[PDB]
Every structure is written in structure tokens, then in C-alpha cells.
Structure 1
């Protein structure tokens, strides 16, 4: 109930909401059908349009007009945005040359530069180049300010999940808005685009920017606009808010445009009908900037122009139907479209089995345009699993396609030629970032970055302390002239032990054997020096990683590699080695095929054993430093140490062997040496965070040897590839992956073929940021470089995506 008989006189676009049954006058009241009776008359005036004309100049104030050309309008704060151009011979902001804003040039009484966030739905990154002739205001912002060639949305690349990621710095799994459509079983409720349930606060986790601002005494303009409120009125309302007295004036403002998403759905991303919506967004930007210039705020305010996601070509005929795969298609609920989420239609059906559904969807058709996953098997870079609202079964749908349940769902609902929601590495899903103002840099290009990083920056721009989030604070310091946040490396929590030779061969009863009984003081001092860390500067280029939790571990040195060996997990947490451009691949000699050797620096009781592997019929083993890349026949014995051993399903060893035997060498050749850090990951509860021992669900049978869920590698070299990796004087270049450790290769539909036809494609799918690996391991990499910490943080957030230009 709303007693809609109160009035909006004097309250148009009021900044505090008021409680039912009092009638409302704020920018959201329409959407709650709670505006007072006179809201349209008083607050949504349209008379005479939005631009001054010559004949309106000097006019007698008529309060019915939408905006004013009278002489008192600047002081009233309600001129049309073009008032000074038409009536005072001033130029449009876009027509002025751009001049560096070295300091904020603000009116008296402004305590800090305001922030205005201009967000555009569906603004695909390539629109900046492809639409540049029709968006001159936006291009001025872009080329005078700071810009990225694109910004990476989060998965799914839907509107609500991304807008709220922009608001919070959080992955959808953490903030709760895991789709545009959702079911929450604890609430027993559903969240739809259409309706009232989405306004209930319990869907929305984290702490969005407006709440962060409010709690720390920064005033926020209300971010959300009811869809009927036209764009021109939203701009004028912001400009009016900026004229408020110092004690009532907000410091942060938001404008949201439904375009160009709305049209892109209809016409496709590059449909000829798309030119006009781009013109119109540009015109709106023009109005804002002309409005700010009138208020002498155009060298005071920081303006962010940011998109939520791009848009891709998608038509009804490119739909896959689950009815062409499953027999039991009525026993499932599908959340459909550019991604697929499947659950049981009824929780009183005990005959529902996800395993059989997945198998019925796996590699069934040769050209298949989706891939099923249990959510915990999705690529870790998507961070799309740790929420009750994400269904156990997920379909990653190919770009340009839809998935639906039955054909009746497509025709009883072609209409659309554009959609989004695909994997966030897809080019067509990328979106835009431009920052313009005193706090942003002048004429600067920055590298692409992920939209989860922006919450921190917006907090920096307003002098707020960010709530805990998934950004890496400092990774975008390079966007900012000032207001930088100066981060420090986390403290190491556990220091290593450096064990020497403490145990005799015969103390070990591991069931391991090695044909190594083959015996010189020249090469005996030499190997002592290799066990004490003589070659470590070669193999450990960036310092040892820091262990950020309490544990017991040993640094072990070898001729070709260095490891941090965990007495708790009975394996390395990390193995570091350098492979030069010139290095050579050998094979494992025949006599050493099954060779595993006791490590005389580590007790039997903190060692794996071979018997467990023999008794575990599912589980085999592999090595972290590969025997194939040994520098000499003698050094190769080090690679068969029990302390280099890790558990591997036979199906995973095909992947791992190919990576170690072929791909490491290929990368060394191409990148002029590489440093490699490899290791295990345990994420049984799929939260993206390092497991404690008591969370491990699987061990090598009859042993305390825990089974990793994944294996990682971080592959570093010199960005200037004319310098070798081991003697790089400048910035670094990195690619990483987090491979799922799976007992089959069902994910790769061509896995019965040679490893050269599928292994690399799989690795690409599971590309990762170093930072993802940090979360999953509790390690901190790149502790000892000559590079600034900001630059390293930027490096740690880099993702190698393998899309073309």
C-alpha cells in the first residue's frame, strides 16, 4: 500500500527515499508504482524539449518548461545543457581542444572531485573504433583521458551480474547475482528480470559502492533510474544535484543507458540500425559534458564511461535443443540461452541422476555447440561455482549459439539477432573503459583489465576504503595521476627449513626401486654445491614464493630445479625451473622408466611411497620437474626423487606428459627461455581458495597422500623477447594455467586422437591469472624482481586469453 495523495512539490528527485505508505518522489518511485499523484506534472516536465533555441534566450522563466533559457537559469541550476552555446556564444565541450587537467579546477566549497559513472549496456569494445565517426564526445573522452582497448566482463556476461560486479568488486558467486534469472533453494524463491522479487535485498550480497560511500560519510546520488525517465531528464537531474549546497550535494553519481544493448538484441551488434543508438548515447554524453562546462565542473569531475558486456550475433536457427539428446527431458528445469543451467524439476524425484544427464550431453554430436560441466569442473578463471544459486550442471555454450530445452520454448515465447552471456574471454563479449578527469591520466592507453578491479579504483577516486573484494588493490594504480593506494607485499607466515643429508637409504621402506647403482672428487664437490643451491639463481628468478599460511615445509635444491616441499601434503607446493632457448629434450631412458628414489634429506614418514600407487588401481603418478628436461644424464636422477612425485590419473598423465615433453620446449623456443613454476592445487569445496588438510576428500588409496583437484603452471619470460628469460632487465611476460586433475578426458571430445590435436586447446581453455593460483595455493609469487610492486600486481592479474585481435 502507498497513500499516493501526498505531493512532490519541492521534492523532485529527493535524495533520501521515504517509507510506505508515504508517497515517493525519488528516481525509483515509478518502478515501485509509489510516486505521488503529481510526480509527472512537477518532476517529469517535457515542455519545449531539451535544447535552447535563439528565440528562447533571455526568456521569462516559465516553470512548465523541461529546462530553461532564462537569465536566472545558471543560479537555479536548471538551464538546458546547450544554454551557453546558443545564448552566450560559448563552444560545445567536444569542439574545444583538449588540455591536460593537472589539478582539479573546482568551485569553492567542493571538498573532492565528484565522480560520475556513465554506464552503457551492451557496449561492445570494438564500437570504439567501428563507431568512432558517429561518437565524437565519447572519442574525445577516450583519447584525452585514460582508456583500455577493452575491459573484460565477468562470467556470465549478463547485465545484472556485471553491473553488480562493477558495484562491488566481487565475482557473481560471491555477490549472489549469478545470472539474470535465478532459483535460491534456501529462500525457496526465484529472481527474474520482470517482477518484484529482485527488489528484495536478500539477493544482493557484498557491499556496493553507494553503501561503501554512505558508511564513510560520502554522499551518493541514487544510482538507479526507472526506465520511463528519459535520458535527458536523468542528465538534468544530475546537473541539478551538482548545484545543491555543499552539505547536501552528493560526491558520486551514476547514469545508466539501456542502449546499445536494447537495439543490439534486435539488430545484431553491427546491424545498420545500430548507428543511431550510438549517435544518441554520444549526444547524451555531449549534454553531460556541456552541462558540466556551464557549471564550471568540466575540469573538476572524474567521469567513467564503462560497459557491462558486449554483444554477439545470435539467431533462433542457431539453437541446440536438449530434446535431441535427453529422453527424460520433462524431468528437468533449464535456465536457457547463452549459458545453460540444469536442475531437477522436482526434488521429490529420487530417480534424478546428474551423472547420466551429463553423459547424455557429452560429445554426442560431431559439431556440438555446447559442453556440459559439473560446475566445479568449469575453468577456474570463471570463478563460477561457489554459490547455492548456481546449478550443479552447467552448459558452456559456443559463441553465436543458444541452448534451449525443447523447440516449443523458442517459437512459443525469428525475433532476436543479438545476444550475450558467453564465456568472458570471448572477444564479442568484451566491453569498454574510459576514465577522464583530474585524477585519471592524460592521453594514456592502459592494458586490458577485468571489471572486478574497478570498485577499488572508484573507492580510491572518492577517498573510500574498499570493502573486501576480488580486485587486487594497486593493480590499476597505472590509470591514476594521483590518489594511488600504495600496497605492500603480504608478510610470509611460514619460513622454510633447509634440510641436509639426514637419512640413510635403508631407513626407507617405500616399495620404490631404481636402477641407479652406478658410482670422482671433481664432480662430487660440484653435486654437493647443487644440493646447497649453487644453480638456484638460474632456476629461481623472482625469489622463492612466500607461504602465506602456517605450515611445515622444506626448500630442496637440485641442479635443474628448486622446490618447496610440504611435510603436510607430502609433495611440493611449488617446483621452480628455468628452460633456456638452447636446452634440449631427452627421453626417459628404459632402465629408469619406473625409477623412484628416496630423498635422503626428507624422513620416510614425510615421504610418499610407491606401494600406495601400486595398490591404487585408479591412481598413478607423475613428476613436477620433468625428467625430459634434465640437463645431463647425471642430473636426471634428481627428477626421480620421491619428493618430486605427485599423484596423477593415467588420463591426466597424457595431458601432463605432452605439456612437459613438447610444450615447455616449444615455449622456451618462442619466448627465448622460460621460467616455470608448477604445482598442485586442492580445491575440494570449489571456493577458489586453498584447502586446509581437513577438506581433502580423496587420498591415494591406503595412504595419507592427498590427491590434487588441479595442477598449475606459471610460465614467465622477458617481455622483450630479444633478452633471454634468465637475464631480463625489464618488464616480464607471463602465461599460466590451472588444469583440472580428472580421471577421464571427457571434456576433450578429440582425446582419442594424438595429444597434438587436443592437449593444447584444453590448456588454453584453462588459462589462468597468477592471482587465481595465489588464492588457490596461499603462495605469493614474484617477491624479488627489479620491477615496481604495482607493475607486478598488474602482471599477476594478467590473463592470456588466446583470442585473436
Structure 2
């Protein structure tokens, strides 16, 4: 119980913690219904609006006004933001020329540049193109500070998961806010964007920026605003807090606007109606900057202007209905719209038949505008599986479409789609002493920002999913010096130690300083050997055409590395070598796979990491058939892999002036995005202990300067990578009955990945020996080739 009888006298938007029975006056009291009786009265004044007029200058201070234009207002810290322009002949901030801020220029008492995070909801990256004609203040921030062309949100591309990701540096599967709405089967409770349950702390994982700041003795302003508090008041409040005594003043502030999201939904992203809300946001930004200038803080504070996600054209006419596919949709609950999550209407309902449901949802219409996935099969780049609040059955919906349960309009826009979709990209601008001046940076992911905000505030970040240092290039100072992880397992270099006669593996090959190092490593291992960051036992193996790190535990390479010149020739597998597998005298029969298992497993076949198709000579091709180059592959997967090995790698070489390729297996049976330990592997080749990868990766590197060959690159690198799911069928690809040239690349693009993703999944550390800085390499590793 809270005693509302109290008063907010001299307490408006106080920063101190106040719990029952005491009544509150902070920006979240209305939301808790615990405001003092005179909160609305004393704290939400509205009299006379938000701007000084000439006729108010040098007025007698009336405490009833929303803001003041009286001569004392500056000391009290509650002038209207335009007071000086209207009353003291100053200029708006926007009208001032841009000037580089080389060091913070802060008033007496300021020890560090405050950080103000200005978040806008549903601000599509492309809105920035509207420029100073529509958004002059924002355009000044963008052009004079540091900007990316866009920032990638997390999936699903909705507000709650993204704002909390910004605050924590975590994927939703880790922070727990996996949707605007979600059901937790252990709580047996439902979280809704609107409603009381969301206020319970049990839902919120990780450690958000305000807690991190607080725990390290840095004071945070509010990161929540009651919907009823108008934007102009949020701005006046932040400015008031910045005018506080040195011993009360916060170091970090957040502003939030629900626009242009609301108008985007109503009118669509390209609607002429979008101009007004964009003008209004820019006006708010100008109030903030005018206010800061008034406080002599405009060259002191760091400002981040940042969106949570974009906005797409979506209308009523583009809705798929599950009732068209399924006989009884009244028995399921669907989280609908721009994504789908399906569970039984009755929790744990035993009659729920997910295999039959998925069957009926799989490639049933030629133009089907969604695709069902068991969550473990979703592209790994989405990182959207390892949480109990994520339903097993998911629908990835096509951009511009909705999925609904059944047919039983006022919107032209929505968002929530796959986070690589162009329309979902959002905005990032940093402006202030700590950011660079007039600098553009490549697009990056919102998970990276928490580390940077910690850097900007002198905080040590809690464990998170950013890669600390990957965004050092945004900053003039306060960069984070990263440190190369130490290798845990050194390799063995096995020489010959066995004779063909030592092997009883069931392999047959109907035909018949070798494997010494130089110069294999300098040709095929361009950026150093991957460091193995876990305890295990493996061998380096050299070959004319490729090098590998062969695991004696998992009985196949952890990685296989090779270079293909632009000029390289593709060759066939000779008829007599079709089924050729050869034992490897370098590796004990006890640490080898046996072809008997393959011969005997009627569902599992095999493939090779280095493709015989790319052998340098008929002689060298024989290396490609070694048992130590072989991996277990379903025939379905082989359709994809052979096309990749025989057509695509060469195509990449030709297009990129040669490529270096590192390929290998990934084991993630528990779908947590991390290297499986032995205990967690659940499938082996029939009758054997050969483990079956859940995915196969390839990392393809070349010279950013394409005029230089990949093997002779003097500068920055270009990288594209994939994590392909290892599945017994191609049900994912609706056109897979056709020739591979019609569907394989489409599948690969969907499963594009960052090198960093592969690192988490393999426990390997790449690019350790290059001519680039460690920070540049971290940037390279977070890169995602999106194909948009």
C-alpha cells in the first residue's frame, strides 16, 4: 500500500528511490499508480506551452507555467529551451556552423562528458535521406558527427526485444524479452506490451546499462518514461537534471519517442503523412540541443541518436491464414503478424501434433509468403532458439506480409521480420567530444552498442554478445584495447607412423617430402592457423592443395584451409575414383573413421572438406580422398555441398580475384550457439562413434582491394561466411526438386553468418596473423554479408 496523501512538493521527477508506504513523484509513478495526489498538478504543468515568445521575455516568474522566460530561469534550470534565442539574441543550435569538438568543453564540476541516448521508435534507416529539408537538427548531428548508413536490429524486429538488446548487449534468447508478447511455460504466465505483468522483474535478464552504471557508482537518469508525459517535458526534465548540483547530477540519460513508429503503422513508411512526425522529432532534438547550448553543454555531452527497428509496407490484403493450411486452428495459439510462433491453445495439450502441423505448412502454395521452422533450424545468425519462451514452431514471414490464424484497413506499415531485411534496418548517429568528426562507419549490429556506451561512461561491461573493440573506429578516444585470446590446445605434427597394412577400415580406392609443411602454409593458411580455445587433441596435416587441423577426438578436421586462384581450373572425379577413400598413414587407425560405417548406414553418406574438384593436379587429387578429409553428409546435404564445392567456390575465386576458404563442422545439438562438448552430441554414423555435425561452415576471405590477388593482399580483407544446416532433407527449399542452380545459392544466402558466429560455435579463433590491427580484425569478424 502506498499513501497517496503525501505531496510532490519540491519532489518532481526526483531521482531518489522511494518505496511504500511513501508515495512517488518520479517519471514512473503513474505507471505504478503510486503518485502523490498532487503529482499531475505540481509536476506536469502545461500552462502557456513549451516556447518563449517575445512577450514573455523578462517576465515575473509564474510557477504555474510549463517552462519559464523570466530573468532567473537560467539559474533555476527551467527556461523554455528557446529562451535565449527569443530573449537574449542567441541562435538556435542548428543554425550554428559545425565545428570539430576535439576535447570535451564542459563547465566547472563536470568530470566526464555526460551521455544522452536519444531513442526513436520505428525510425527506418532510409528516413535519414529526407535530410535537412525535413530534419535539420538530426541532419547536423549526422553530417557533423559519426554515422552509419544503418544499424542492424535483432530478431524479431519489434520494440521490446530491441530496446532491451540496446540496453544489455544481449540477444533476446539471452536477455529473455524474446517478443513484445510471450508465454513462459514455467511461470505459466503471459507478458504483454500493455498490461501489468511486464513490471515483474522475473522476465528481465542480463544487466541493463542503468544497473551496470549504478553498480559501478555512476548515476543514471531514468530509462523509462510514462506514456502520459509529453516529449517536451521529458526534454525539460533531462535538462533540469543536468542543472543539478555536482553531487546529484546523473552521468547518463535516455530519451524515448514512440514516433515515427506510430505514424509508420498507420500510413506506411513511404506515406506523405510521414513528413509531419519526422519534423516533430527533429523539433524535439532541436529543443534538446538548444537547451544544452543554453547550459553550455553542447560541446560537452555525447549524444547517441538511435532507432530500435525499421518499418515496411504491410497491408490487410497481404495476409496468409493458417486456416487455409490446417484443419483446426481454433486449437492453437499463434503469435501473429510479421512473425509466427505457434503453441497449443491449451498449454501442454497432449493432442498437439507439431510434425503434422509443420508438414501441412511446408511448401503448400507456389507463392507461399512464410516458411515454417523448428527453432533449431532457423538461420544461426538470428540467435533465436535458446530460451524456453521461444516456441518450438516458428514461422519466418516474407517481408510485406502478415500471417494470421484465420480470417475472423487502418494500417499500412509493420515490422518484425528477419533482421537482415532492408526495410527493418534502423539508425545510428553519435555526436560529441568522444565520437569522431564528419565520419561514416560501416553498418553494425545493435548488440555492439552496450560495450561502447560502457566505454563512453568509463564502465566495465557485464558479459554480453558484442565483440568489444569491434566498434573502436567510431571513437576519437575511450577506445577499448582488446587482447588476443590465448590458445589452449597446441597441435601435433604427425609424420608417417603407420603402413597401409595397419588399417582395417573398410575403405577402398580402385586406383593408386610428401605432406611436409613448406610451402603449404604460406599458400593455404593466409591469416595464421586458427587458435583452438578449448582442451582437445588434434593434428596439423599438410597437403599440396590444402591444410587442416584434424581432431583425434571428433575424427575429422576442426577446420580445412585452402586457397583458390582466380585462374584455377575445375576438374572431375574420375570414374574409377568415385568411391575412393584412402587411409592416412599419418594418423592412427584408432583415430580414423571407417568406411564400413558409411557402407552400412542406409541414410548417411559422406563428403569432403577440400573438394577433389579443385585439385591442382591429377596426382594431387589423391589427397582429397584421404579419410582425414572426409565428413558425414546426408545425400540431401550433399546436393548443396557438391554444388558449393564444384560451382560456387570457383565462381567466388573468379569474381573476387581468388579466395581463401576455411571450411569445417559445427556441433550445436542444444542450439545455444556455442561449441558442443562431447556429452552434448546426440547423433553418430550408424554403428560407429563418428559424430554428425549439425552444420557445416565456410569462411571465404579475399582482398578488399579486388585488384590484388587474395594470396598477395597488402591491405584490408573482404569476408563472407556461411553456417549451413546439416539436414536429412531439403524441405526448407521449396524449389529443390529442380536443378541445384535454381535453389542452392538462395539457401546459402539465408544462412549467411559472421565469422564471430562460427567462432562461438567452434571454439576457434581466426585471423590471428595479419598485417591489420586487432580492432580492424574484430570489425571484420562481426561483418555479415546480407545479400540485400
* TM-score scaled by length of structure 2: 0.99
Pick which of 79-88 and 127-136 moved more: 127-136
SS at match of 2:211: helix
Contact kept, 8 Å, 2:515 with 2:541, in 1: the verdict is no
Larger mean Cα displacement after TM superposition, 21-30 or 577-586: 21-30
Q: Per the alignment, do residues 131 and 97 of structure 1 end up closer, same or farther by CA in structure 2, a change over 3 Å counting?
A: closer
Instruction: Give the C-alpha shift of residue 678 in structure 1.
Output: 0.1
CA deviation after TM superposition for structure 1 residue 17, in Å: 3.2
| 1:499-555 Cα deviation digits (max 9, x unpaired) | 000001011100001123xxxxxxxxxx91543342220100000000000000000
Deviation sequence 1:61-115 (CA, Å, 0-9, x none): 1111111111111111111100110111111100000110000000111111000
1:352 deviates by 1.7
Give yes or no for the alignment of 1:752 onto 2:737. yes
CA contact (8 A) 1:299 1:437 kept: yes
* Partners of 2:344 and 2:544 in 1: CA distance: 55
Q: Give the conservation status (yes or no) of the 8 Å contact 1:572–1:643.
A: yes
Separation in 2 of the partners of 1:396 and 1:155?
A: 11
User: Which residue does 1:741 correspond to in 2?
Assistant: 726
Q: Is the 8 Å Cα contact of residues 531 and 559 (structure 1) preserved in structure 2? A: no
Q: Distance in 1 between matches of 2:518 and 2:741?
A: 36
Number of the residue aligned with 2:488: 493
Work out the CA distance in 2 between the residues paired with 1:406 and 1:309.
27
State how far apart, in whole Å, the 2-side matches of 1:655 and 1:533 are: 33
What is the rounded CA distance, in whole Å, between the counterparts of 1:616 and 1:466 in structure 2?
Answer: 49
Report the Cα distance in structure 2 between the residues aligned to 1:535 and 1:221, rounded to whole angstroms.
Answer: 58
Secondary structure of the residue aligned to 2:697 is strand
The secondary structure found in structure 2 opposite 1:717 is: strand
Partner of 2:784: 799
- Cα distance in structure 1, aligned partners of 2:22 and 2:265: 38
Distance 1:638 1:597 in 2: 8
SS in structure 1 opposite 2:323? helix
Query: Is 2:479 the counterpart of 1:484?
Result: yes
In structure 1, how many angstroms separate the alpha carbons of the residues matched to 2:234 and 2:17?
Answer: 17
* 1:768 CA drift (Å): 0.1
Aligned residues between the structures: 788
CA deviation vs aligned residue, 1:13-48 (integer Å, no higher than 9, x gap): 011231123211000111112211111111111111
Q: Check the 8 A contact 2:520/2:547 in 1, yes or no.
A: no
> Is residue 131–residue 275 contact of structure 1 (8 Å, CA) maintained in 2?
no
Q: How far apart are the structure 2 equivalents of 1:202 and 1:510?
A: 55
Instruction: Give the Cα–Cα distance (whole angstroms) in 2 for the partners of residues 328 and 356 of structure 1.
Output: 12
Once residues 263 and 232 of structure 1 are traced to their aligned partners in structure 2, the CA distance between those partners, rounded to angstroms, is 19
1:422–1:132 distance in 2 versus 1, CA, 3 Å: farther
Q: Deviations over 1:317-355 (max 9, x none)?
A: 111000000013222111111000001122453222211
Deviation at residue 288 of structure 1 after TM alignment: 0.2
Residue 2 of structure 1: CA displacement? 2.7
Q: Does the aligned pair in 1 maintain the 2:131–2:139 contact within 8 Å?
A: no
Q: Report the counterpart of residue 133 of structure 1 in structure 2.
A: 133
Cα distance change on mapping 1:272 and 1:698 into 2, 3 Å = same
In the alignment, what sits opposite 2:428?
A: 433
Using the alignment, how far apart are the partners of 2:586 and 2:668 within structure 1?
29
d(CA) in 2 for partners of 1:20, 1:207: 25
CA contact (8 A) 1:493 1:549 kept: yes
- Contact 1:182/1:191 (CA < 8 Å) preserved in 2? yes
TM-superposition CA deviations, 1:725-772 (whole Å, max 9, x none): 000000000000000000000000000000000000000000000000
Q: Does 1:65 align with 2:65?
A: yes
For 1:531 and 1:407, the matched residues in 2 are separated by 68
CA distance in 2, matches of 1:338, 1:428: 12
Distance 1:533 1:403 in 2: 58
- Structure 2 counterpart SS, 1:633: coil
Q: How far off its partner does 1:4 sit?
A: 1.1
**Displacement of 1:132 after TM fit?**
4.0
In 2, the alpha carbon distance for the partners of 1:333 and 1:45 equals 45
Q: Secondary structure at the match of 2:429?
A: strand
Asked if 2 retains the 8 angstrom alpha-carbon contact of 1:533 and 1:558, the reply is no
1:256 alignment partner in structure 2: 256
Moved more, 54-63 or 675-684: 54-63
Determine if contact 1:106/1:296 at 8 Å carries over to the other structure: yes
- For 2:95 and 2:257, the matched residues in 1 are separated by 24
Q: Is the 8 A contact 1:676 1:713 kept in 2?
A: yes
Question: In 2, are the aligned partners of 1:131 and 1:278 still within 8 Å (CA)?
Answer: no
Kindly indicate whether the alpha-carbon contact (under 8 Å) linking 2:467 and 2:778 is maintained by their aligned counterparts in 1: yes
Residue 131 of structure 1: how far off its partner (Å): 4.9
Contact 1:17/1:26 (8 A) holds in 2: no
Encode CA deviations 1:264-284: one digit per residue, 9 max, x unaligned.
Answer: 111111211110000000000
Computed over aligned residues only, the root mean square deviation of the Cα atoms, in angstroms, reads 1.0
Question: Deviation string for 1:555-601 (max 9, x for gaps)?
Answer: 00000000000000000000000000000000100111000000000
1:691 aligned to which of 650, 672, 676: 676
Q: What does 1:639-678 correspond to in 2, within 5 Å?
A: 639-678=624-663
Runs of 5+ in structure 1 lacking a partner?
409-413, 517-526
Contact 2:312 2:415 in 1 (8 A): yes
SS of 1:643's equivalent in the other structure is coil
Deviations 1:613-647 (A, max 9, x none): 01111100000000000000010000000000000
Q: Given that residues 115 and 303 in structure 1 are in contact (C-alpha distance below 8 angstroms), is that contact kept between their aligned partners in structure 2?
A: yes
User: Aligned equivalents of 1:285 and 1:718: distance in 2?
Assistant: 41
CA contact (8 A) 2:498 2:588 kept: yes
Per-residue CA deviations over 1:651-704 (Å, capped at 9, x if unaligned) read: 000000000000000000000000000000000000000000110010001111
CA separation in 2, counterparts of 1:133 and 1:697?
A: 59
Larger displacement relative to structure 2 (29-38 or 537-546): 29-38
